[PDB]
Amino acid sequence: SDSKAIAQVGTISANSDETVGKLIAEAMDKVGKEGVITVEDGTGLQDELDVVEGMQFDRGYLSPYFINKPETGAVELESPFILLADKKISNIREMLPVLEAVAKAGKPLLIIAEDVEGEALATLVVNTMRGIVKVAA
Amino acid sequence: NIRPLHDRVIVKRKEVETKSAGGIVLTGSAAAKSTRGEVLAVGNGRILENGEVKPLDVKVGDIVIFNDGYGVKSEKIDNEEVLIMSESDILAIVE
Amino acid sequence: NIRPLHDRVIVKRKEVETKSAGGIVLTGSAAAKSTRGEVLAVGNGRILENGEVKPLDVKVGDIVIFNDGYGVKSEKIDNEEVLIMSESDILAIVE
Amino acid sequence: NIRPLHDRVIVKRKEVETKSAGGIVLTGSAAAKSTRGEVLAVGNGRILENGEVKPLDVKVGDIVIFNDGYGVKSEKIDNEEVLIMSESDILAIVE
């Protein structure tokens, strides 16, 4: 259970390589008992460990104009609302009530849906930089 | 100056609304063409089968609700688009 | 405020009932659109061939049964949906 | 309690016959839906071109033979199917 013994086991199992054992012990300590660790090919000549805390999934923004911090090319929202729509969003008409309510509230909105069609995407992106609502999809 | 014949009325539609019930701006196919207009000219009246003519109920200056169909014609008068339409297509008068 | 012309009547359909002769709720295509409504405004009356007018039978405040069709039009007034349709589409009046 | 307008009549369709001219029982699409009914309410009268009304020939309590078509509409009153149809759709009255 100690991290020293974990490092020793990882060192022995890797043909007596101390760095591998230290890296694996550190990764196990950081991730925890209930997490997962993965090994993949790198680019440089040294090993690196990247630990992701919280939830993250491999889907990006649906339109470049949603970016509000162009320095890093990323969309950052503070205290957002999350709309989880288990359906195809194609028409903006179904979204007027929630959009009006969010605009009244004054907090940003993030829409996670099956997909967004051009009409709704265009309406949302037009509303983004106009200063009415802050929306990403 | 233009005036219609018989029971025809000339109307001009109002501009399509952008913001609807809030700051959300509608762009694209959602922003449908307005079905309200301003009457500019009024015909003398519809000719009855007997031969006499009765005046049209709509008067100049009113705001009317109508339906777009095959009977509504759009003409580019004096660099200002207006509609020539029959009185039967006028559904109601606002206020 | 809007007033119809001639033999047209303005109604608003009642809300679709969910419960159906018991606790079973209906959601989706099974719960069809209501076929009853409330008259808000009544037109002046149909124009006869000679020229004289006759008042409509429906009076403001009644509940009507009507057939949906291509002639019935829906217009958004005061952020509320209403139906503008002719008096020939009224089938009967309840009570 | 509903009363039809103009020349419309409300009828209730008679139950389809299963035992046909002897012991043979009919089930499925062979048993066509009945084309006889019972008149419940009668409209005031059809409006002529001049303006006067003509009372309908069918009287409440009669049994009628009608042609089902696009003009006959089915609607629900007191959780029972009844037919709203024009008096022109009634072919003949039995007895």
Curated annotation (Swiss-Prot), chain A:
Post-translational modification: Phosphorylated reversibly during heat shock. Can be UMPylated on a tyrosine residue by SelO/YdiU, probably under stress conditions.
Localization per Swiss-Prot or TrEMBL: Cytoplasm
Disulfide bonds: none
Top-level lineage group: Bacteria
Entry similarity comment: Belongs to the chaperonin (HSP60) family.
Domain notes: Each subunit is composed of an apical domain that binds non-folded proteins and GroES, an intermediate domain and an equatorial domain that binds ATP and is involved in inter-ring interactions. Forms a large central channel that appears to traverse the entire length of the cylinder with no obstruction. The central channel of GroEL functions as two cavities, one in each ring, that are separated from each other by the crystallographically disordered 23-amino-acid C-terminal segments of the seven subunits. The entry and exit of polypeptide seem to be restricted to the apical end of each ring. Modulating the volume of the GroEL central cavity affects folding speed in accordance with confinement theory. Small proteins fold more rapidly as the size of the cage is gradually reduced to a point where restriction in space slows folding dramatically. For larger proteins, either expanding or reducing cage volume decelerate folding. A stepwise reduction in cage size results in a gradual loss of cell viability.
Function: Together with its co-chaperonin GroES, plays an essential role in assisting protein folding. The GroEL-GroES system forms a nano-cage that allows encapsulation of the non-native substrate proteins and provides a physical environment optimized to promote and accelerate protein folding, probably by preventing aggregation and by entropically destabilizing folding intermediates. Also plays a role in coupling between replication of the F plasmid and cell division of the cell.
Subunit structure, interactors included: Forms a cylinder of 14 subunits composed of two heptameric rings stacked back-to-back. Interacts with the co-chaperonin GroES. Can form asymmetrical complexes, composed of one GroEL and one GroES, and symmetrical complexes, formed between one GroEL and two GroES oligomers. The asymmetrical complex is the functional unit. It was suggested that the symmetric heterooligomer may represent a transient intermediate in the chaperonin protein folding cycle.
Designated name of the protein: Chaperonin GroEL
Curated annotation (Swiss-Prot), chains B, C, D:
InterPro entries in the record: Chaperonin_GroES, Chaperonin_GroES_sf, Chaprnonin_Cpn10_CS, GroES-like_sf
Cited function: Together with the chaperonin GroEL, plays an essential role in assisting protein folding. The GroEL-GroES system forms a nano-cage that allows encapsulation of the non-native substrate proteins and provides a physical environment optimized to promote and accelerate protein folding, probably by preventing aggregation and by entropically destabilizing folding intermediates. GroES binds to the apical surface of the GroEL ring, thereby capping the opening of the GroEL channel. Regulates the ATPase activity of GroEL.
Gene Ontology molecular function, alphabetical: ATP binding; identical protein binding; metal ion binding; protein folding chaperone; protein-folding chaperone binding; unfolded protein binding
Name this polypeptide is given: Co-chaperonin GroES
Gene, per the UniProt record: groES
SMART domains in UniProt: Cpn10 (SM00883)
Modified residues (N6-succinyllysine): K33
Activity regulation remarks: Activity of the GroEL-GroES chaperonin complex requires Mg-ATP.
UniProt keyword Ribonucleoprotein present: no
Pfam families in UniProt: Cpn10 (PF00166)
Keywords: Chaperone, Cytoplasm
Main localization of the protein described in the UniProt heading: cytoplasm
Disulfide bonds: none
Assembly information from the UniProt record: Heptamer of 7 subunits arranged in a ring. Interacts with the chaperonin GroEL. Can form asymmetrical complexes, composed of one GroEL and one GroES, and symmetrical complexes, formed between one GroEL and two GroES oligomers. The asymmetrical complex is the functional unit. It was suggested that the symmetric heterooligomer may represent a transient intermediate in the chaperonin protein folding cycle. Another study shows that the symmetric heterooligomers are substantially populated only in the presence of proteins that cannot be folded by the chaperonin.
A biological process from GO: chaperone cofactor-dependent protein refolding
